[PDB]
Amino acid sequence: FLKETFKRIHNMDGLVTGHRQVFKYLERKRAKICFLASDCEEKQYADIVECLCKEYHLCKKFTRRTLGELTGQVRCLADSDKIIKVVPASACVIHNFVDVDSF
Template identity: 35%
Template sequence: MIHGGLKKGLHECAKALDRRAARLCCLAKDCENDEYKKLIKALCAEGEVHVIMVESGKDLGAYCGLAKLNEDGTIKKAVRTSCAVVTDFGEETRALSVLLDFLQKHADGAEI
């Protein structure tokens, strides 16, 4: 989010995937709309974008910063999102290297 490289929701994600600007896609397993999942997976396959499946949309929303936190840092309320796309990873860090290594090892579809 800091570098402006995060897109959330079907409309933003589909536009980024269609323009081939996406580098990584996260999709919630508990998304109830099968057409939604098929569209995102097809766009990812067409653009050769890695897909990471996340257990729940609330978790994905919290990962994207769509959550209100308590004073102690625990999540008080999270907004659900079914899809998020990273278009810009930002600066090169150790965490980015670990993520890219993970994606290369699990090229067929990772789950977290």
């Protein structure tokens, strides 16, 4: 029960994905929560960020695939529905924050 909120956020592009963008967003201290991958080949992309976040409010969804489409990042038809095309993200960061029910 959390998908309901993200839909409006992405319309203002609050959700941010990617290793080179997530890093910089948190280091500026302007983030509310962050997410991870169920797994990944190298800890570095996982265990490097986790300390940088603990040292400087985390979750983890066992489905790393939900993290892709939940953050837009999806191709759909011009007629609604969708292509069933999803890029598998790995981390996202909420800036504006513009959920509260779940926490």
